[PDB]
Design a protein around this ligand. Structure first.
Ligand SMILES: [Ca+2]
Ligand SMILES: [Ca+2]
Length: 269
């Protein structure tokens, strides 16, 4: 039996699926710890920029979890992604330890722009700015990639890099009450929020696990971006990004929530 995680129904993904929008034909790169083969995922390809882990398989669990929020297959098992038909690419930029070098992350973004990815999911972030990282964000953006990044989990009134950068779409996390999760970074540069507490998804070892974080919120928006892209195949990264913000449900302060909660129903109308 397939279950629909609360976050998926919170962002109203099923409303979009009911109109025929599933992310079909949209290429989404998950820049993380890799993506493990799983019965509820369809991994189209990818690359590893982690020296010492040539494989795109996930030795951590985060990347597989993020992948499932975006595109867990719509079938009779497991869970269901926001964009269950999106074409998923495993871009390994973090090691099994869940940490990685900036250069690996910048190589992953270059790879994304070089391979015609429409969306790049970066559920990672640093409190420090990086010239190298910034340039990779800007380069992928001018190659038509929508870069979606986590705001961070410090609970501070300032957001992480690269989410802070103008060309990154910064995603904060909400709980089941539609309040900002205590750990969710907010402040200047925050674009939007999505579910990030008790998020159930795919996990290595052919199972399912629940995690918390701004990393969990981000894929809901990457997924929402693929739905909009499918509906409006001529739209650019910027057009998609503004539309998502324009159709988000206000939750109160833009300092805390940016545009508000992503809404895939409103975005695909
Ligand atoms: Ca499924
Ligand atoms: Ca931003």
């Amino acid at each position: 039996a397939q279950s629909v995680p609360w976050g998926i129904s919170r962002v109203q993904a099923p409303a979009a699926h009911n109109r025929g929008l599933t992310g079909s034909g949209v290429k989404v790169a998950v820049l993380d710890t890799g993506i493990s083969t799983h019965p509820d995922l369809n991994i189209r390809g990818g690359a590893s920029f982690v020296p010492g882990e040539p494989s795109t398989q996930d030795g951590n669990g985060h990347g597989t979890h993020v992948a499932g929020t975006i595109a867990a297959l719509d079938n009779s098992i497991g869970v269901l992604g926001v964009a269950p038909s999106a074409e998923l690419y495993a871009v390994k930029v973090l090691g099994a330890s869940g940490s990685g070098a900036i250069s690996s992350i910048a190589q992953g973004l270059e790879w994304a722009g070089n391979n015609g990815m429409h969306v790049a999911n970066l559920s990672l972030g640093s409190p420090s700015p990086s010239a190298t990282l910034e340039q990779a964000v800007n380069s992928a953006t001018s190659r038509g990639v929508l870069v979606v990044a986590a705001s961070g989990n410090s609970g501070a009134g300032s957001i992480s890099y690269p989410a802070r950068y103008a060309n990154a779409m910064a995603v904060g996390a909400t709980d089941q009450n539609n309040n900002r999760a205590s750990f969710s970074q907010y402040g200047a540069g925050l674009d939007i929020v999505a579910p990030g507490v008790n998020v159930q998804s795919t996990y290595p070892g052919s199972t399912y696990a629940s995690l918390n974080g701004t990393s969990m919120a981000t894929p809901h928006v990457a997924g929402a971006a693929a739905l909009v892209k499918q509906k409006n195949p001529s739209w650019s990264n910027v057009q998609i990004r503004n539309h998502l913000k324009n159709t988000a449900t206000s939750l109160g302060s833009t300092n805390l929530y940016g545009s508000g909660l992503v809404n895939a129903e409103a975005a695909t109308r």
